[PDB]
Amino acid sequence: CLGIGSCNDFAGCGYAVVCFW
Known part of the structure; x- marks a missing residue:
């Protein structure tokens, strides 16, 4: 959940560098 x-990050909230999917 950042830009x-x-x-x-966590289900529709925003972006991530370390990929959860």
Whole structure:
């Protein structure tokens, strides 16, 4: 849940660098 540009943090909330999916 931040505004970067690789994958998603926790189900629709925002972005992630370390990919949960």
